Design a protein around this ligand. Sequence first.
Ligand SMILES: COc1cc2c(cc1Nc1ncc(C(N)=O)c(Nc3ccccc3Br)n1)CN(C)CC2
Ligand SMILES: COc1cc2c(cc1Nc1ncc(C(N)=O)c(Nc3ccccc3Br)n1)CN(C)CC2
Lengths: 289, 285
Amino acid sequence: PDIFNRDPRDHYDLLQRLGGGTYGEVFKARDKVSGDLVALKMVKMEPDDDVSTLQKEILILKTCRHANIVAYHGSYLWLQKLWICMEFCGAGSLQDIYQVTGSLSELQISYVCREVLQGLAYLHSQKKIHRDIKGANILINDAGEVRLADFGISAQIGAELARRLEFIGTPYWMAPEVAAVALKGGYNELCDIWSLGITAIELAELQPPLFDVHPLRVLFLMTKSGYQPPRLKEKGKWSAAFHNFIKVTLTKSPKKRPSATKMLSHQLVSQPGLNRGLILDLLDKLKNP
Amino acid sequence: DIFNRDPRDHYDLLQRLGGGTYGEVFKARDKVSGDLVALKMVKMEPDDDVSTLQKEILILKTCRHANIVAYHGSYLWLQKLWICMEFCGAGSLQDIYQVTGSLSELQISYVCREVLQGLAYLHSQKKIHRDIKGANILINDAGEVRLADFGISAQIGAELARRLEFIGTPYWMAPEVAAVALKGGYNELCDIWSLGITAIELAELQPPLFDVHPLRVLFLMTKSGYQPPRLKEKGKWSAAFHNFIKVTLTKSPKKRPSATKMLSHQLVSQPGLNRGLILDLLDKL
Ligand SMILES: COc1cc2c(cc1Nc1ncc(C(N)=O)c(Nc3ccccc3Br)n1)CN(C)CC2
Ligand SMILES: COc1cc2c(cc1Nc1ncc(C(N)=O)c(Nc3ccccc3Br)n1)CN(C)CC2
């Protein structure tokens, strides 16, 4: 792992803020001599966080090398601040893109979905769960390539971890099975596949299904026994293969829902002519209308 | 029957009792008769459904169990629900033990019996308390024991808005993930565990691991070789209290005894458990 106990503002000039909230800030940063653009995730560290196991996640991040997951370059630890230096994806998220470009073509969506599934197939074989597949978290570089973020080690510490404890409340009276669920949730690996199903509709239609309907109402509808999963609005615009991809990804029963590996042999995503050219056309549409 | 009327017409709000996520709670006097009640003010927001709200209130009205705080009525003035309830004048057992110090084994056994009677009722009504602790076991001036009810108040207002904010946008969330985000791992038998820990709390002024960080406690509890808590001072307490703690604090939920099963346990089925034990406590003040 080797977290360098040094100020990263010495080594990179922070150009521009990209986003943040609970986890911390993410900046666009230039490598001072070499001119390489990176993403610096500044994480707020707090005194009761273990530095020993923190390095073991960073060791997993270093030894990991999958193409559809954002690359880890290195760690700095200056004044109660972990800085995770990462790959920069210069076009932003697909949300940032679609809000300017409008809806993606079926081919563009098919390529995105294949690249996400390759990322999800890798994370699940490493016993991890993404937990948050949406348009806003699928990043696009200038080459038209597709990258997932990784909120793995950032979830285990800091202000996002303190947020997850604050709603849970004092744990001292809580039973073991209640505490088990308070850590995990209902999140297993296959919920990412559902979430991709919703994402593909989002990219298709500029919104996930029920986005105009109250969050609670949606939660109750989802849980009630005869909940029909969502579908694409405009049947004729999309091919049968896209409809089937949405049907099978949005299987209600987790036991019966296909895994990332199973999904990569689906017609929509195994078809030829799916490559980054499709996204270069999209990024061109962002510049030239 | 939610009365579309101002409750400040019918009651004088005397004094604030505390708290504020679930709602703010005032001690209130009935204007003519002088009867004391507890009024829980909840701040409501415009997209809260009044239809199913009445069905919980209908279950609360038709309910008449003695160990659960009694529901008197609901009032709805300007985007503010006010839930009129039974008053318990001695406060919570936490408020009490912070002045009195530790309860005797007999006092604890009486509290435990009255809570289990409440929990046996709630579980037969398919509900779960979710929050059995010293601070939520109330004591009236008669020495009697009442559980609170954060049932319908959890389904609306600022506590409902908080539960949505941490869960985050549900639109991308899978059904099984949403199911767990509503329920939790709360089943009925977690209240029995929670009472087990409450009995220790009453015994020792703190739950077990109170000086250990919340996260560390959550990870310890979940890891495979987690030993449940026990009482510190073996000699001070009887074997029956130790067994009550051992069986209530069973890790495996399938093997952990229900409220009904627990009421026929030795500690709480013994004679001489009555409100006199708590009158002695309230007298120590
Ligand atoms: C020109 O590059 C960008 C423009 C914009 C956005 C993102 C980028 N690039 C970008 N590249 C790489 C990463 C990375 N290694 O993780 C990243 N992370 C990130 C950013 C914001 C929040 C959380 C995270 Br995690 N972001 C995000 N949008 C919301 C506004 C525009
Ligand atoms: C002299 O009576 C009291 C003194 C005090 C406390 C409680 C009481 N009595 C009391 N009786 C009944 C209820 C009820 N129908 O629910 C209640 N509600 C309540 C009050 C505060 C918070 C949450 C809730 Br629910 N409160 C609470 N303590 C923390 C500080 C002092």
